[PDB]
Amino acid sequence: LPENVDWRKKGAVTPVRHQGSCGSCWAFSAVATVEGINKIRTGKLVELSEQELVDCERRSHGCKGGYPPYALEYVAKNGIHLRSKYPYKAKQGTCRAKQVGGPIVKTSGVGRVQPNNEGNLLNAIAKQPVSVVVESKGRPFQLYKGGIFEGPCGTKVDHAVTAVGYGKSGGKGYILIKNSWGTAWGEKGYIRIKRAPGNSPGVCGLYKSSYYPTKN
């Protein structure tokens, strides 16, 4: 695979956002992967609506969490609106998907990374942004303000974020994660999580559950 990939270098990653007052990480992560395969297949970076998935993705639970593959299923069946035509309110509303103008971004299906294995994950990352899970409940994670993150954390994953790159940095393997906690957190909104090698739940269960949208 390439030894280092950064989708931000590619123009495939939109600015860091903030969830505000809502458990919508599932939606923000599915959004970010969909922006990325979007820019990769079409050349156009656009920002898409997290609020469409909070209000319309009925299998997820709004502002009380959700599941990145369901969201990704949602986009494959229904496509998904411009963040500007269906703006983010940080609470669960009724689904307005029908009433919103602008172009729909559409995908065709969902890719499941075979979990618990480093190279499977990077093979996916080396092709596009991937939705992954992490255990975020640990103080070290919530107070993370930069460096290669090795824990401590457990594998009780509770938070969906987006793998937007991976690489080696003054010799450690990491994965480059876009969080949705604002640019105040971590390295201006990103985290570099230590790569466990081969077959592993990953640092902080980083390998336990990886999905991406398929398109074009």
Nearer Cβ to Hg ion, position 65 or 102? 65
The residue of the chain with the least Cβ separation from Hg ion equals 25
180-185 contacts, C-beta under 8 A, 24 or more apart: 180/16, 180/17, 180/18, 180/19, 180/24, 180/25, 180/28, 180/29, 180/32, 181/18, 181/19, 182/16, 182/17, 182/18, 183/15, 183/16, 185/144, 185/145
Among the listed residues 22, 63, 179, 204, the single catalytic one is: 179
Report the interface residues with Hg ion, using CB under 5 A.
Answer: 25, 159
Q: Torsion over CA of 51, 129, 14 and 32, rounded to 10 degrees? A: 0
43 — phi, psi (to 5°)?
Answer: 80, 5
* Catalytic residue flag (residue 116): no
32/25 Cα distance (integer angstroms): 10
How near is the Cβ of 130 to Hg ion at its closest, in Å?
17
Question: For Hg ion, which is the closer residue by CB, 40 or 185?
Answer: 185
Nearer to Hg ion by Cβ, of 25 and 48: the residue is: 25
Residue of 22, 25, 63, 95 marked catalytic: 25
| Residue 92 vs 123, nearer CB to Hg ion | 92
User: What is the nearest approach in angstroms of Hg ion to the Cβ of residue 190?
Assistant: 16
Question: After which residues are there C–N gaps above 2.5 Å in the chain?
Answer: none
Shortest gap between Cβ of 159 and Hg ion (angstroms)? Answer: 4
Quick check: is 25 catalytic? yes
Positions at the binding site for E64: 25
Query: What's the closest the beta carbon of residue 108 comes to Hg ion, in angstroms?
Result: 27
Closest CA to 88 of 24, 176, 168: 24
179 is catalytic: yes
Task: Identify the active-site residue in 56, 95, 159, 204.
Answer: 159
In this structure, what token pair is assigned to residue 83? 């963040």
Catalytic residues: 25, 159, 179
